[PDB]
Amino acid sequence: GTILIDLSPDDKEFQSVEEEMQSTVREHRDGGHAGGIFNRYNILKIQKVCNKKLWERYTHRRKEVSEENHNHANERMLFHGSPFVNAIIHKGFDERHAYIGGMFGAGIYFAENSSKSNQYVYGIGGGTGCPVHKDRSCYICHRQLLFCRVTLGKSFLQFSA
Amino acid sequence: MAHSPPGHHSVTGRPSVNGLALAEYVIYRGEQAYPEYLITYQIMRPE
Numbered sequence: 001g002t003i004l005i006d007l008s009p010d011d012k013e014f015q016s017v018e019e020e021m022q023s024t025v026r027e028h029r030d031g032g033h034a035g036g037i038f039n040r041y042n043i044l045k046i047q048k049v050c051n052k053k054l055w056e057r058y059t060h061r062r063k064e065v066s067e068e069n070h071n072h073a074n075e076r077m078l079f080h081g082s083p084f085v086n087a088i089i090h091k092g093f094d095e096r097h098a099y100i101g102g103m104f105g106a107g108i109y110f111a112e113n114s115s116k117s118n119q120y121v122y123g124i125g126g127g128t129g130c131p132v133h134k135d136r137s138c139y140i141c142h143r144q145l146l147f148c149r150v151t152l153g154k155s156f157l158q159f160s161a
Numbered sequence: 162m163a164h165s166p167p168g169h170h171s172v173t174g175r176p177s178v179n180g181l182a183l184a185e186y187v188i189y190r191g192e193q194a195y196p197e198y199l200i201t202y203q204i205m206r207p208e
C-alpha cells in the first residue's frame with residue numbers, strides 16, 4: 001500500500017529536506033573509505049512516502065511511548081541509509097533492518113549527520129561500494145537515503161568515541 | 162533485536178572524541194520509525 005509522491009524543487013518541503021541533507025554533511029574519520037569523498041550532494045529527487053497502515057503502526061507506538069514519558073514522544077527527524085531502503089518503504093522497519101553488530105547493540109540505527117547514514121547505503125562499512133563499479137566513492141551511481149520520523153521517548157545517553 | 166535499556170525507549174550515542182560529529186540513535190522496535198522521505202542523490206566530487 002505504499003505510494004511515492006514526488007516533491008517539486010520549488011516546494012518549501014523539498015527545500016527544507018534538501019537543506020537538512022546538505023547542511024549535516026561532515027568529514028569522517030575513515031577519510032571517506034566507507035561513504036566516499038565529498039562535501040555535498042547532487043539531490044536528484046525527494047519523494048514523500050505514503051502508507052496508511054505503516055503510518056498508523058507508527059502513531060500507535062508513538063502514543064504508547066508518549067504516555068510512558070509525560071506526554072512526550074521525543075520525536076526527531078533522522079537519516080537512515082541501508083541496502084534495504086526499498087523494502088523499508090513498502091513493509092516498514094522491523095528486526096531485518098537492525099544492525100546486529102552496532103556499538104549500542106542489535107537495533108535500528110539513525111544519524112543526525114546525513115553523511116554518517118551515507119556510509120551504510122551499500123552495506124556495513126560501505127560493503128563493496130556501488131553494484132555497477134564496486135566503488136564506495138562512486139560519483140555516477142544513484143544512491144538513496146531515508147529521512148525518517150523517529151520516536152525516541154526516554155533515551156539512554158551513552159557517551160562514546 | 163536487543164531490548165532498550167530498562168525504563169528507556171531508545172539509546173543516544175553522544176560523540177565524546179570528535180567535536181564535529183552529531184549524535185546517532187538506536188531504536189529496538191521497528192514501529193518507532195516511519196520512513197517519511199525517500200531521497201535520491203549522488204555524492205559530488207570535490208572541486
Ligand SMILES: CN(CCO)c1ccc(-c2nc3ccccc3c(=O)[nH]2)cc1
Pocket residue numbers: 079080081082083084096097098099100102109110111116117118120123124185
Ligand atoms: C540492516 N543492516 C545491515 C545489517 O543488518 C544495516 C542497516 C543500516 C545500518 C545503519 N547503521 C547506522 C549506524 C550509525 C548511524 C547511521 C546508520 C545508518 O543510517 N544505517 C546498519 C546496518
Ligand SMILES: [Zn+2]
Pocket residue numbers: 130131132133134135138139140141
Ligand atoms: Zn557506480
